[PDB]
From Swiss-Prot, chain B:
Residues engaged in binding ADP 2: 15, 41-42, 119-122
Name of the protein described by the UniProt record: 5'-AMP-activated protein kinase subunit gamma
Protein family according to the UniProt entry: Belongs to the 5'-AMP-activated protein kinase gamma subunit family.
Effect of loss of the gene: Leads to a decrease in the length of G1 with respect to the wild-type strain along with a smaller difference in the cell cycle length of parent and daughter cells.
Subcellular location field: Nucleus; Cytoplasm
Ligand binding (ADP 1): 101-103
Residues at which AMP binds: 15, 20, 41-42, 119-122
Mutagenesis or variant effect for residue 103 to E: Decreases SNF1-activation efficiency
């Protein structure tokens, strides 16, 4: 019950592997390949310096086709994140509301530092047994 | 634009692989193991005769924890405030996936029994192959 108030940065649950990113100039078709090959349902979109500006989700692709155009153009006019300091309690709530499988972790300036997956939260809970 | 009107049962996208199920009496703690080991975010709840009863999600688990996770799936369902057939058109299914935000759609036959599943991942691969 006390683990809920502990900052995720100390919960040994954030990972920095398999979080390949894309850019405003990345073709959608290329991002689809990233989603399928990487077993992920969303890819982070950052700039040249590493700042997280948004994300491209498998859902967006479904809306897109009711190809080669970049991610920027694909999101043109159509209808998330946390820091290592946030508490697991508020994060689990935001995950439920937004219904996403990955919460990207950004530093104090907005740069992508890691990712917190729903899978790792569940495993944390599973071990919560014992 | 014509593939959107084709029934998924003819799109060679439905699978019968990783789809282990559970029951109303299955302890949530056991369900959590299925989600993690199967690398899935939801598990189909079926009964003794194969009928699809409901679906339990990882999001549901997060709900129970604002306490003991040995409680059955049945009881857990009480604390929370999906499906299709091989005849449904791809267009209808992609819209429902988008609106409900799920990664898997369980496929049932005409009698309501689970016969397979349709993952978002496979829909994407189907789209990707659109590079012909």
């Amino acid at each position: 019950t006390h683990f809920l108030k502990i900052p995720i940065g100390d919960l040994n649950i954030i990972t920095q592997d398999n979080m390949k990113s894309c850019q405003m100039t990345t073709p959608v078709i290329d991002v689809i390949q990233m989603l399928t090959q990487g077993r992920v349902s969303s890819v982070p979109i950052i700039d040249e310096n590493g700042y997280l500006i948004n994300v491209y989700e498998a859902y967006d692709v479904l809306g897109l086709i009711k190809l080669s155009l970049s991610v920027g153009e694909a999101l043109m006019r159509r209808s998330y994140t946390c820091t290592k300091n946030d508490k697991l309690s508020t994060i689990m709530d935001n995950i439920r509301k937004a219904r996403v499988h990955r919460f990207f972790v950004v530093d104090d300036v907005g740069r992508l530092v890691g990712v917190l997956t729903l899978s790792d939260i569940l495993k944390y809970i599973l071990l919560g047994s014992n």
